[PDB]
Design a protein around this nucleic acid. Structure first.
Ligand SMILES: [Mn+2]
Ligand SMILES: [Mn+2]
Ligand SMILES: [Mn+2]
Length: 430
DNA sequence: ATTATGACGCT
DNA sequence: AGCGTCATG
């Protein structure tokens, strides 16, 4: 009806860098460009663990969370780049700095929400209004959308990928009412024009290619971004949602790839997101809780209200290291030495953060895992963070965790520690 | 031994 | 405050 709100108020984009860590290494080392390549952490155990994979390597079945030795079985010519190691641990500074490069360019076009090291949501609503009032009813040319897919098109009454892309785009642009400055489809289209410009600026000024999704909210923008990777962007209109969701596994929607999504599937006896529409809001709230139920009721209709938060910088700065198998920490000197290594990296990153961003952290969170505990964190404890001093930070973390040592001998540490994590939180403008 | 993080919800 | 969940470069 004329009041059933349709969640079409906003234009939201999700920009995701393609195989980011790989692109950072390929920019630095041209020998790795346009090759099957992957980025690995460490080397000794099974060749190191892969954390990023070029699309050429993905064609061979290489994935993240794969040991490099196994990846080399699938792709013997796979090229590898190793993450920096400093103070005995992986150091991701190069990739954080590259991320800042990209986030600063995105911020020129609109306010962004840093969702991860390599992805940000963009609220384009205002930028779209301004570009519309600049165009003054002039139609949008396909030339303004050279890497855009329109999800769901072409449809109705060439065998090449780009030919299909252009056919769908032409169907979309023909149907456009470029006279209605309040038409949601037109607003999304102008949003996509802007995202083409943003992605062009990112590639020109960093060398990095990215994909993007443009829709009316964050969940649809994220889903859209994944439909045509790499180096492409996808527009998911409100109208495309019924068909898109009719065959979309529930786990593909952000927030539903874990336990909650499995419970939606099992409790309701469904497989696809579109099947959620048959339940009342009260029914969904009865199985999944007030918040999740309302969210699911709206999401399966393409509607979600989560705002793009104005936040370009991480809320937390943390340092973590696992000590698996034999490498678990069994002496107090071991535990203190590694706490100091982590605290030294933390101090360096925190000092750079305070210089760059005019803020200081005030809470230190210390997390540990003990051997035999299946939970990723066995214990989390906070203390005050009043000085950027690695020695103080590490002594405080030790003070806060030392009561976990069940060993009657203070020299020994039982049960051995399989993970240490230091996290600076609660920033204040400084 | 699937590693180093980061965000957020729950109570 | 501490724990759990979800994401995944
Ligand atoms: Mn990415
Ligand atoms: Mn990403
Ligand atoms: Mn990924």
């Amino acid at each position: 009806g004329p009041h059933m709100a349709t969640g079409q108020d906003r234009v939201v984009a999700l920009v995701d860098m393609d195989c980011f860590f790989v692109q950072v290494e390929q920019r630095q080392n041209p020998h790795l460009r346009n090759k099957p390549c992957a980025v690995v952490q460490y080397k000794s155990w099974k060749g190191g663990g892969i954390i990023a994979v070029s699309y050429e390597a993905r064609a061979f079945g290489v994935t993240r969370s794969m040991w490099a030795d196994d990846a080399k079985k699938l792709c013997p010519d796979l090229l590898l780049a190793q993450v920096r190691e400093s103070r005995g641990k992986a150091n991701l500074t190069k990739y954080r700095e590259a991320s800042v490069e990209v986030m600063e360019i995105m911020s020129r076009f609109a306010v962004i929400e840093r969702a991860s090291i390599d992805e940000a949501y963009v609220d384009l609503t205002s930028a779209v209004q301004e570009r519309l009032q600049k165009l003054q009813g002039q139609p949008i040319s396909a030339d303004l959308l050279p890497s855009t897919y329109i999800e769901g098109l072409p449809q109705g009454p060439t065998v090449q990928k780009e030919g299909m892309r252009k056919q769908g785009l032409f169907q979309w642009l023909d149907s456009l009412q470029i006279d209605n400055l309040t038409s949601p489809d037109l607003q999304l289209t102008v949003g996509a024009v802007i995202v083409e410009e943003m992605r062009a600026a990112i590639e020109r000024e960093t060398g990095f290619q990215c994909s993007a999704g443009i829709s009316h909210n964050k969940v649809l923008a994220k889903l859209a971004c994944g439909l045509n990777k790499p180096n492409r962007q996808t527009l998911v209109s409100h109208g495309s949602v019924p068909q898109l969701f009719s065959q979309m596994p529930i786990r593909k929607i952000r927030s539903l790839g874990g336990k909650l999504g499995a419970s939606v599937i099992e409790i309701l006896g469904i497989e696809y997101m579109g099947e959620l529409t048959q339940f009342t809001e009260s029914q969904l709230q009865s199985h999944f809780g007030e918040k999740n139920g309302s969210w699911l009721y709206a999401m399966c209709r393409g509607i979600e209200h989560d705002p793009v938060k104005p936040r370009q910088l991480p809320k937390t700065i943390g340092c973590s290291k696992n000590f698996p198998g034999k490498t678990a920490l069994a002496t107090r000197e071991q535990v203190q030495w590694w706490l100091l290594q982590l605290a030294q990296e933390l101090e360096e990153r925190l000092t750079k953060d305070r210089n760059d961003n005019d803020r200081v952290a005030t809470q230190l969170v210390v997390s540990i895992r003990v051997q035999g505990d299946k939970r990723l964190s066995s214990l989390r404890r906070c203390c005050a963070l009043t000085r950027y001093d690695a020695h103080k930070m590490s002594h405080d973390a030790f003070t806060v965790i030392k009561n976990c040592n069940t060993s009657g001998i203070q020299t020994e540490w039982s049960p051995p520690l399989t993970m240490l994590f230091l996290c600076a939180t609660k920033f204040s403008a400084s």
